[PDB]
Amino acid sequence: KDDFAKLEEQFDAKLGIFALDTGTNRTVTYRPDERFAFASTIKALTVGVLLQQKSIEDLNQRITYTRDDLVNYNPITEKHVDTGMTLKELADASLRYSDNTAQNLILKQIGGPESLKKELRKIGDEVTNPERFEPELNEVNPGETQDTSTARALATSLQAFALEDKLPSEKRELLIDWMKRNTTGDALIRAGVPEGWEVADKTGAGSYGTRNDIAIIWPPKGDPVVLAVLSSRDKKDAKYDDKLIAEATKVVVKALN
């Protein structure tokens, strides 16, 4: 646990780590049960739940929306107000670009934050606590439990949809394929794994310099590793440093080797 403490001192941040080798049941933990704002990592679990409810052809359904439906950061969705987008394309934009309107439209389709919460409780996640849409969910103050979870619960919930029987294999593959092709995580978990390791991740960023990455990772040979790396800082307007997540990942890899 001293390598993580030194990282917490170097980057002046609090770290939350849970890693599991699905093949050996070896874990690496550090503040595994401390709450952090989940931020955009919730996008992964939201698509997890959508996949539970929608058939593949349901995903071809066109969703119309307006300029007023758009929020702060909509890289894909703002470009398609006139024509709408299929659920499939919204999931793609939400996961790989972290498009906030895409997320919000998907969350509405599943019934809103309380419905997402209920579905997570059903799969045994008693920790994750969604209450809000994007971008307001990204802002969580100290001591608050709204829109928070833990390294352990995020990893376990991600593990549930991507690797266990919470989704049938084809839908697992679809989720994994989107997350493999994520565009926002090059400097995080991806930067901390050895050459030839495959990564499917979702990133998050929030107030208090909160910087998260959750992933399934595959060594060259062997079973996948489930990893959540969460972080926050003590000032509301703090900047995060991606190098903290990359280095923490390197510690996880070393400890698992």
Ligand X SMILES: *C(=O)/C=C/N[C@@H](C(=O)O)[C@](C)(Cn1ccnn1)[SH](=O)=O
Question: What are the residues binding ligand X (CB under 6 A)?
Answer: 39-40, 72-73, 98, 100, 135, 138-139, 204-207
CA distance 161 to 51: 9
- Which residues, at least 6 apart from 77, have a Cβ–Cβ distance to it below 8 Å? 65, 70, 85, 90, 93, 99, 101, 102, 105
- Separate counts of helices (H) and strands (E) for the chain: 8, 9
238 vs 256 by CB, closer to ligand X: 238
State the CB neighbour count (10 A cutoff) for residue 55.
10
- Which residues, at least 6 apart from 169, have a Cβ–Cβ distance to it below 8 Å? none
Whether cis (ω within 30° of 0) applies to the bond prior to 75 is no
* CB burial of residue 103 (10 Å; 0-12, 13-18, 19+): buried
40 is catalytic: yes
As measured in angstroms, the least distance from the Cβ of 254 to ligand X is 28
28 vs 37 by CB, closer to ligand X: 37
As measured in angstroms, the least distance from the Cβ of 51 to ligand X is 20
| 136, 139, 198, 207: the active-site residue | 136
20 vs 102 by CB, closer to ligand X: 102
Which residue number places its CB atom closest to ligand X? 40
111 vs 135 by CB, closer to ligand X: 135
As measured in angstroms, the least distance from the Cβ of 135 to ligand X is 4
As measured in angstroms, the least distance from the Cβ of 100 to ligand X is 6
94 is catalytic: no
As measured in angstroms, the least distance from the Cβ of 196 to ligand X is 28
* CB burial of residue 20 (10 Å; 0-12, 13-18, 19+): buried
CA distance 162 to 38: 18
98 vs 182 by CB, closer to ligand X: 98
Q: Annotated catalytic sites, by residue?
A: 40, 136
